From a paper:
The intracellular fatty acid-binding proteins (FABPs), a family of 14–15 kDa proteins, are divided into at least nine distinct types, named according to the organ where they were first identified or the expression predominance. H-FABP is mainly expressed in cardiomyocytes, skeletal muscle, and several other tissues such as the brain, adrenal gland, kidney, mammary gland, and blastocysts. Known FABP members are composed of 10 anti-parallel beta strands that form a β-barrel structure capped by a short helix-turn-helix motif. In cardiomyocytes, H-FABP binds to long-chain FAs and transports them from the cytoplasmic membrane to the sites of lipidation and hydrogenation, where FAs are eventually oxidized to produce ATP and provide energy for myocardial contraction.
The crystal of mouse H-FABP belongs to space group P212121 at a resolution of 1.5 Å. The protein was crystallized from 25% PEG 2000 MME, 0.1 M HEPES pH 7.5 and 25% PEG 4000, 0.1 M sodium cacodylate pH 6.5. Both the Matthews coefficient analysis and the self-rotation function suggest the presence of one molecule per asymmetric unit in the mouse H-FABP crystal. One ligand molecule, the palmitic acid, was determined to be present inside the barrel cavity of H-FABP per asymmetric unit. The FABP–palmitic acid complex was formed during the expression of the FABP protein in E. coli. H-FABP adopted a β-barrel-like conformation, composed of 3 α-helices (α1: 35–39, α2: 51–58, α3: 62–68) and 10 anti-parallel β-strands (β1: 41–49, β2: 74–80, β3: 83–89, β4: 94–99, β5: 105–109, β6: 112–122, β7: 125–132, β8: 135–144, β9: 147–154, β10: 157–165). Notably, the lack of backbone hydrogen bonds between β4 and β5 prevented the two strands from forming a typical anti-parallel β-sheet. Instead, hydrophobic interactions were observed among the nonpolar residues of β4 (I97 and F99) and β5 (F105), conceivably stabilizing the β-barrel and the ligand’s nonpolar tail. The Arg161 and Tyr163, which localized in β10, had direct interaction with the carboxylate group of FA. The tail of FA was inserted into the hydrophobic core, which was formed with Leu150 in β9, Phe51, Met55 in α2, Ala68 in α3, and Ala110 between β5 and β6. Comparatively, mouse H-FABP has one more α-helix (α1) around the helix-turn-helix structure.
Numbering used by the authors: 0 to 132
């Protein structure tokens, strides 16, 4: 499936408005200070219909395991306890998180060999560019 092309190890090389995105979510000053400095590595694995996404950095590490279209519980890096759903739309992996009546969407797409992660919360949009190792 289109999800197979995402498999690999990816390193952050560019970031726009991630602090705005964290501030919109309610991430505090001290975590924002450090998180703005991180250049995470994301490792994406797929085993049959189970997809694993690890995000790793010197600050915080996260891991999620999911199947497309099946809701799962997630505890985000900023300790939101969210209900999450990931689906494929064309070539885009769309990850929607919901908590406390709020919602944010993390979209992953391959563009010219790079992984573009778009983070949307309300009107705030952050774009994170990852390069394959
Ligand atoms: C796990 C390393 C990420 C460092 C940031 C931790 C505090 C902010 C968390 C906000 C939501 C997570 C957004 C993911 C960003 C990404 O994968 O590049």
């Amino acid at each position: 499936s289109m999800a197979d092309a995402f498999v690999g190890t990816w390193k952050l090389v560019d970031s726009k408005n991630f602090d705005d995105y964290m501030k919109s979510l309610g991430v505090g000053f001290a975590t924002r200070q450090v998180a703005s400095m991180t250049k995470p590595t994301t490792i994406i694995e797929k085993n049959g219909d189970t997809i694993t996404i690890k995000t790793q950095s010197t600050f915080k590490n996260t891991e999620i395991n999911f199947q497309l279209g099946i809701e799962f519980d997630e505890v985000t890096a900023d300790d939101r306890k969210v209900k999450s759903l990931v689906t494929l739309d064309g070539g885009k992996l769309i990850h929607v998180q919901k908590w406390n009546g709020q919602e944010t969407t993390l979209t992953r797409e391959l563009v010219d060999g790079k992984l573009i992660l778009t983070l949307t919360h309300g009107s705030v949009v952050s774009t994170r560019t990852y390069e394959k190792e």
